[PDB]
């Protein structure tokens, strides 16, 4: 009698449902029941089975309450018969491995899906015991009809509960969160120290961190349908990142992902269909499958849909090379045109010292946590050295400044910056004043208020901290803004250790450029995007063309206008480009026959140099020991601020002598040997660079970086350290800007 029931819920494509439970002896089967319980559009369970696990007098109450207790002590969502059925009773679905079949099948009730089963499953296979040949063809049997429904858009919305993954690789990295709030099952449960992808509760900001339970902005725009229900996405994304940082030397592919998506029910089918779209988003954005990883020939990191386009890259530095290796891996045509007769740009190592690599340019990694440079070091098996915190301030000549005098003046200097941060509050760009002009004004305005009188030693030790600040801005504080001198710290910066990349950045650079079509000695002089596609013309005349174009030239070269743009850049960009400063420092390295400083230095990775006057304050302020093993004996020092101008007419012999004049002051108690080898950078005069790293000019704003990074008509793109607002100046920034633009270029 009374045969058919139906479904209670709105929109269900099933009026005569079948039960999957098969629990109760009195299972209503396809027959009639008091009420159907909706799990999806292909999964309902009757009320007789509902009672089997729910009613204290039935034969399942013991399994349900055992699970219920565990669910309430590990999870945050409410335990329900519907949650139990979806986490324990639903049959797993597995897709056949046969390349020619690939049909989705339901496994028997008591079968527990494992990654090993999903890897080697074939139609009609019994995971019980091992492959003994059979005379029956299970791969021609019609695929269950509910499998096609699954990929209809509406299907997900009508899923009552979210998919909670079992045994996710991210489980260990998310033990601080309730499992079910990050897309994992409450009934569940040797990485590189520098890999910490997941925000931890109560943690402050640290760069390149994702929230395990919140979709970032670009994720909302890329997948809008997940702004109402984000659970499945967050589950798969945290798994992808968990897999990537678990093995960052291999290209992560949909194939090796699937065996780790473990969830009962048809929803799994939807998961493996989506993990592929999510995995390609992560790749285009550069969250995974990035770094020094090389792909070829053959196995391009994106579907051929992204492949049919050509782009030209101007400048083969960290930026242009980062984007090059990326667009190359995606499967896109890439031709990069460099000006100099070498690659690397502001990355230029000198491997001519004995048992030591010294960098004419970049060589320090500022904060290693989540830094792409640390990842690219894992991928290259390279190791780094962590700077000690000890830096003694040696005067002229020999005396190591008294700690009490040192701390004293560090406090006061930092205080001077506290009040600079106060004054600047609410001022506009028009009310901007040179940082240095403000610190002086505040400095005297304080000596006035109190008869406190600084000694010539205290006053000089303060100068060292002004030069130190000029060393980071690569400019005299009188040209650097007071409002925006640290604009970027408004955002989350790279935490962790500051290190010295011992092998040198050149390593990571040469590995990125490996196999790329890099035309050297091909300075670009004109760029015409007024036609159908872009036309890049070199200084000798050689013509190139491509659909897109990515300029990554140094800031200084954009202000000089070296490249003719047709049409020209917007008056706004020109203002944004010119409102930033082209910072500059120069380095100097000296090799000696023996370590003469070990006696007073005592291991310190460096030593400071207290300026005699405020004019010679940028002249070799800090001296770095370029051997973390303390074996060989090289020294590297820096010229910054006003001092880089007092040295632009001199030759190297002169610079050497001014550097030796100071070493022998700093070390008066001893004979300091003569440098058997040395070099004195000339980044100022290098025609295609003309700078060290950018800063914000008085009256400017960090918004300028974003304006520069604006693409034009979705054709011309920009990158470089002067286009990464969050992280300016650094190789890291220049690198991430490359990746960023690779993403933009691949979408269009």
């Amino acid at each position: 009698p009374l045969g058919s029931r139906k479904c209670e819920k709105a929109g269900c494509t099933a009026t005569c449902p079948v039960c999957f439970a098969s629990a109760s002896e009195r299972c209503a089967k396809n027959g009639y029941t008091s009420r159907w319980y909706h799990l999806s559009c292909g999964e309902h369970f009757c009320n007789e089975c509902f009672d089997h696990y729910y009613r204290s007098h039935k034969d399942g109450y013991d399994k349900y309450t055992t699970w219920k207790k565990i669910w309430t002590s590990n999870g945050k969502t409410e335990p329900s018969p519907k949650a139990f059925m979806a986490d324990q009773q639903l049959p797993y679905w597995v897709q056949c491995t046969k390349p020619e079949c690939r049909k989705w099948r339901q496994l028997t009730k008591e079968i527990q899906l494992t990654p090993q089963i999903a890897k080697t499953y074939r139609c009609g296979m019994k995971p019980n015991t091992a492959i003994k040949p059979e005379t029956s063809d299970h791969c021609s049997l019609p695929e269950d009809l509910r499998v096609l429904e699954v990929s209809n858009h509406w299907w997900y919305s009508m899923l009552i509960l979210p998919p909670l993954l079992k045994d996710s690789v991210a489980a260990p990295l998310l033990s601080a969160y309730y499992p079910d709030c990050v897309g994992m099952s409450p009934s569940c449960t040797g990485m590189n120290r520098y890999f910490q992808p997941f925000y931890q509760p109560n943690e402050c900001g640290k760069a390149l961190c994702v929230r395990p339970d919140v979709m970032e902005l670009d994720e909302l725009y890329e997948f809008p349908e997940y702004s109402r229900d984000p659970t499945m996405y967050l589950a798969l994304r945290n798994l992808i990142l968990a897999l990537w940082y678990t093995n960052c030397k291999e290209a992560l592919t949909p194939q090796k992902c699937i065996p780790h998506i473990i969830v009962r029910g048809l929803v799994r089918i939807r998961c493996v269909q989506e993990v592929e779209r999510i995995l390609y988003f992560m790749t285009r954005k550069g969250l995974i499958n990035t770094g020094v990883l090389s792909v070829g020939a053959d196995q391009y990191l994106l579907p051929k849909d992204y492949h049919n386009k050509s782009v030209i890259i101007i400048g083969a530095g960290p930026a242009g090379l980062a984007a090059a290796r990326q667009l190359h891996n995606f499967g896109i045509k890439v031709t990069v045109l460099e000006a100099k007769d070498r690659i690397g740009g502001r990355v230029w190592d000198d491997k001519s010292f004995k048992g030591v690599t010294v960098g004419r340019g970049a060589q320090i990694v500022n904060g290693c946590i989540n830094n792409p440079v640390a990842l690219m070091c894992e991928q290259l098996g390279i190791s780094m050295h962590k700077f000690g915190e000890r830096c003694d301030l040696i005067q002229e000549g020999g005396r190591i400044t008294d700690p009490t005098i040192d701390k004293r003046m560090d406090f006061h200097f930092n205080a001077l910056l506290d009040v600079v941060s106060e004054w600047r509050k609410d001022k506009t760009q028009l009310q901007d004043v040179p940082l240095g002009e403000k610190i002086e004004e505040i400095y005297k305005a304080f000596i006035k208020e109190s008869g406190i009188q600084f000694s010539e030693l205290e006053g000089q030790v303060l100068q060292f901290h002004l030069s130190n600040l000029e060393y980071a801005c690569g400019s005299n504080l009188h040209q650097v803004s007071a409002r925006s001198w640290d604009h970027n710290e408004f955002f989350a910066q790279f935490a962790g250790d500051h290190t010295l990349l011992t092998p040198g950045y050149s390593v990571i650079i040469e590995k990125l450029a490996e196999g790329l079509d890099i035309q050297l000695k091909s300075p670009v002089q004109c760029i015409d995007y007024s036609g159908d596609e872009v036309q890049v013309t070199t200084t000798d005349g050689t013509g190139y063309s491509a659909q897109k174009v990515l300029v990554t030239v140094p800031l200084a070269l954009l202000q000089k206008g070296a490249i003719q743009f047709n049409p020209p850049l917007s008056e706004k960009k020109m203002k944004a480009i010119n409102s930033l400063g082209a910072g500059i420092i120069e380095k100097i390295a000296l090799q000696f026959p023996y370590r003469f400083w070990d006696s007073k230095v005592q291991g310190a990775d460096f030593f400071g140099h207290v300026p005699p006057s405020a004019s010679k304050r940028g002249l070799f302020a800090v001296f770095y020991d370029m051997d973390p093993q303390k074996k060989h004996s090289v020294l590297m020092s820096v010229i910054a601020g006003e001092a880089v101008a007092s040295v632009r007419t001199l030759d190297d012999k002169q610079v050497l002598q001014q550097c030796m004049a100071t070493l022998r002051e700093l070390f008066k108690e001893q004979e300091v040997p003569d440098p058997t080898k040395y070099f004195v950078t000339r980044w100022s005069t290098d025609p295609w660079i003309q700078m060290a790293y950018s800063f914000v000019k008085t009256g400017g704003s960090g918004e300028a970086y974003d304006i520069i990074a604006e693409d034009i008509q979705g054709t011309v793109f920009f990158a470089g350290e002067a286009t990464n607002r969050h992280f300016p100046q650094t190789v890291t920034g220049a690198y991430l800007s490359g990746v960023r633009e690779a993403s933009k270029i691949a979408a269009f």
């Binding site: 601080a176 941060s421 600040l469 980071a472």
Partner: peptide, 26 residues
């Protein structure tokens, strides 16, 4: 930018540290 400083980092002038109050918190 302060961020480029390695040896001897200046600490004054920083904006107040801030924290994301997640609800998936324990």
């Amino acid at each position: 930018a302060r961020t480029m400083q390695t040896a001897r980092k200046s600490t004054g002038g920083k904006a107040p540290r801030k924290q994301l109050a997640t609800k998936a918190a324990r």
